[model samples]
Target: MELWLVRHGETLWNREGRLLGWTDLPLTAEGEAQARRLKGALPSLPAFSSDLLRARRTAELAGFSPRLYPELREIHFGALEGALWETLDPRYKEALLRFQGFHPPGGESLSAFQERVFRFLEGLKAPAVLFTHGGVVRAVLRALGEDGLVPPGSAVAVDWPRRVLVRLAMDGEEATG
Candidate 1:
């Protein structure tokens, strides 16, 4: 089975570099256009997305008939949602430093997030396109044994039109796209 893991297009929060976990933010106009472009480039496959508006809108704009999955939602940031980085309390910063190892106040731990995503992928039949978030994509890649993958927004693909396909892959009980 093949998986096409796509990060949802930009949102108001994304533009502002604000934390947007579990917050319902609509896609920006640029995001819509990007989604449309991605739609035109994508291969035929069933789609699934987190139950967030940004992701849902991306799927719709991309012309994908998506199945909503709350399980695939971004990590719950609790009180940190929609807040700018500077506005976050120092404690939050300290917690973030330990993120992927510890849970922030009112936030889910990275391990928990990974567990949920892994479970979701385990249940999937594959050959599917997943419209989700950067963190989720990273988690999926990590689960697929792509350790030390670059941070989100980094350009890792070599080809343009076929970039998405080439950069994603799956290996026995693990998937990367």
Candidate 2:
């Protein structure tokens, strides 16, 4: 099976480099444009999205009515929500820097978060598209052996269980695995 994972467009927090987990925010005009541009690049497949407003709006603009699922949401940042990464305490920053399933205070552990994402992955019975977050894409890539970050609105196609096929970017760049 093929799994197509697409991260949502930029949020206000995204431009400010602030943590954007679980705190619902609207997409910026540029973000909406980014989302709209995805339609022509992707295959028309059954899609799924996180229940968050940003993800839903992205899907809507991308020409897909994905089945919404809370399971597809970004990792819960808990108390770290909205904190600027550069200003975070050393300990908090280190915990994330050492992202081995690290769990921030009042947040889900990196391991637990991966488990949540994995459960959703395990349920895939056919080719599918998922509109989610950068973190979600990162974890999925990490599990597949490449930990490079995915920019907002980019998509990655992977063969089930762990073979990356291609990475598609909004700038019309394509990287084949």
Candidate 3:
């Protein structure tokens, strides 16, 4: 099945370089603008969104009323929520950068997080648009062998459990992977 994974637009934590997990922050003004840019760019399909405010709003701005799903949410940072990236421990930083071997205290483990995300994908029976967070997008892309470092409000389309198709950004750039 084809899947479009959209990294929700910027929140304050996104601009501050913080570990943005399940804190429920909304988008910034620029984030709204970025979402607007996606309105015409995205394919019309069955849509789903993270239950978080940011992702939900992004879906709306992008002209989709999506089914909200908590499984589409970002990894729960727990105690590490809102931690500045630059000040994080080396281990945590490495895990995040590599997208593996992570076990945040009081939060979801990397394996568990991946399972949750993949399980959701596996349940989809057809092509769909998913308005979600960066971590969710990165998890899907990394699983498909890309670097998975897309900017906020960007999107990646992939053949699920197969290969990536294309990446789209707010600047109107598109790339094949």
Worst 10 residues of 1 by lDDT: 152-161
Tens digits of per-residue lDDT for model 3 on 1-177? 789999999899999999989999999999999899899799999999999999999999999999999999999988899999989999999999899999988999989988999999999999999999888888988888887788899988999878888888725447789
Q: Scored by CA lDDT, what does every candidate get?
A: 0.68, 0.85, 0.91
Candidate 1 at residue 36, lDDT? Answer: 77
Rank order by TM-score, top first?
A: 3, 2, 1
Q: Show model 1 residue runs off by greater than 4 Å.
A: 87-99, 144-165, 168-177
Model 1 steric clash pairs:
169-176, 169-177
Error of 1 at 17 (Å): 1.3
Measured over all alpha carbons after superposition, the RMSD of each candidate to the real structure, in angstroms, is: 7.9, 3.8, 3.6
